[PDB]
Design a protein around this ligand. Sequence first.
Ligand code: A1CIU
Length: 266
Amino acid sequence: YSLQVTLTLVCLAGLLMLLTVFGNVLVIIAVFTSRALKAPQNLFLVSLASADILVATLVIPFSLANEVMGYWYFGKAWCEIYLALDVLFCTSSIVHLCAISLDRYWSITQAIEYNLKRTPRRIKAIIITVWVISAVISFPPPRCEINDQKWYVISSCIGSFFAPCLIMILVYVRIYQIAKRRTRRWRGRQNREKRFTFVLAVVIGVFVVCWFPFFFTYTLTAVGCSVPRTLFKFFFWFGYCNSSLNPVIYTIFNHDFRRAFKKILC
Ligand SMILES: Cc1cccc2c(Nc3ccncc3)cccc12
C-alpha cells in the first residue's frame, strides 16, 4: 500500500470521523437541550444521530485499518461480525431517513388524523421497528471481504436501499406537488417557492448521490457485471461520507435547530 499517501488517507478519514461524531452529538444535545424541540418527531433524528455516531466511531477504524494496513489484522473471529454490524448500522441510518420522510408525508397529508396519532409511544414503536428490521436484514452474513452470495447480496441491497429510496422519492415528490399547488406578498410567495424547491432538491439529491453509486455498483458486481474497479472504494467511501452530512441536511433548514446550534456555539 502507499507509504506517505497512507498518512494522507488516514489523516483524511480521521477528519471524516471527527466531523461526523461532532455534528451528530451536537444534534443529540440541541435536541435534548432545546425546549422547542420537545416534539415526538425528533426522536427519529436522535436515533439517526446515535446510529451514525456508532457507525463512525467503531466501523470506520476497522475499514480505515483495512485498505490502509492493506489486510485484516484483527481476529478472523471478527470479520463475520464486523461486516454484519457495518451493514446493520448503515441500513438503520437509511431506514431512519425513510421513516422520517414517511412521517413528514403523513403529517402534511391527513394532518389532523396523524397529529391525533403522533404519540411518542408510536414514535418509539417506529424506532424499534426500524432497528429490528435493520437487525433482521443484517442477521444473515490475513484478509476479510464482504459477502458474495448472489441471491443474498441482491436481496439485501434491494430491500435495504432501493425500497427506501423509492419511498423517499415518492413522498418528497408528493410534498413538492402539494407545496407548488398551494404556492399560488407575491414576491415572498415566489421566494418561498424557490426556497422549498431548494431545501427538497438538496435532501433528495445528497442521499441519492452518496448511496446510489455504491449500491448500483454493488449489485453490478453481484449480478456479474462487476465493472467497478477501485472506483467501488471511492463509491464505498462516498457512503460513509454521506453520514457526516446527513445531520446537516435534516437540521440546518429548521430555525428552531439553527438557533439552538447558534446558542450552543456561542
Ligand atoms: C447491504 C448493505 C447495506 C448497508 C451497508 C453495507 C455495507 N457497508 C457500507 C457500504 C457503503 N458505505 C458504507 C458502509 C457493505 C455491504 C453491504 C451493505
